[PDB]
Amino acid sequence: MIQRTPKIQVYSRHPAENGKSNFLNCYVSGFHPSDIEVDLLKNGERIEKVEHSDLSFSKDWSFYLLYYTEFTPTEKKEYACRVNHVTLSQPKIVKWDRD
């Protein structure tokens, strides 16, 4: 068995086709097992309709999830990614550092 804590990166990307589109991304990488809970948050609020949850694996025991959705960030909110994984005794919340 192997378990690997996800690396969690939260970042925004504008698809080059539409600069006004902005995706909040939670890239959860390298984890195993694949069981995982990933949410994008705005303040504590789960962003419900995350358009993309792209899971892949490299090696059988390394999973990668790009969990991203269009958003329109306000300065008035914090955006984060919350990951639960067995390796994470507490939900890991990684804030988007937009600047």
Residue numbers in the entry: 0 to 98
Provide the publication's sentences verbatim.
Here, we report the use of the TPBLA to explore the role of the protein sequence in determining the aggregation of the naturally amyloidogenic protein, β2m. β2m is 99 residues in length (10.8 kDa) and has a seven-stranded β-sandwich immunoglobulin fold that is stabilized by a single disulphide bond linking Cys25 and Cys80 (31, 32). The protein forms the noncovalently bound light chain of the major histocompatibility complex class 1 (MHC 1) and is important for antigen presentation. Another example is β2m, in which aggregation of the wild-type (WT) protein is associated with the deposition of amyloid fibrils in the joints of patients undergoing long-term renal dialysis (dialysis-related amyloidosis [DRA]). More recently, two single-point variants of this protein, D76N and V27M, have been identified in amyloid deposits in the viscera or tongue, respectively, with the former occurring in the absence of kidney disease.
To examine the structural effect of other amino acid substitutions at this site, the crystal structures of seven variants (D76E-, D76A-, D76S-, D76G-, D76Q-, D76Y-, and D76K-β2m) were determined at high resolution (1.15 to 1.52 Å). Comparison of the crystal structures of D76E-, D76A-, D76S-, D76G-, D76Q-, D76Y-, and D76K-β2m with those of WT- and D76N-β2m revealed no substantial differences that could explain their different stabilities and aggregation propensities (RMSD < 0.6 Å over all heavy atoms). For D76N-β2m, the network of hydrogen bonds involving the sidechains of N42, T73, and Y78 found in the CD and EF loops of WT-β2m is maintained in the variant. For other variants, the loop structure is maintained despite these hydrogen bonds either not forming (D76A-, D76G-, and D76Y-β2m), or being reduced in number (D76K-β2m hydrogen bonds to N42, and D76S-β2m hydrogen bonds to N42 and T73). Together, these observations indicate that the sidechain chemistry at residue 76 plays a role in protein stability and aggregation, but the behavior of the variants cannot be rationalized by their crystal structures alone.
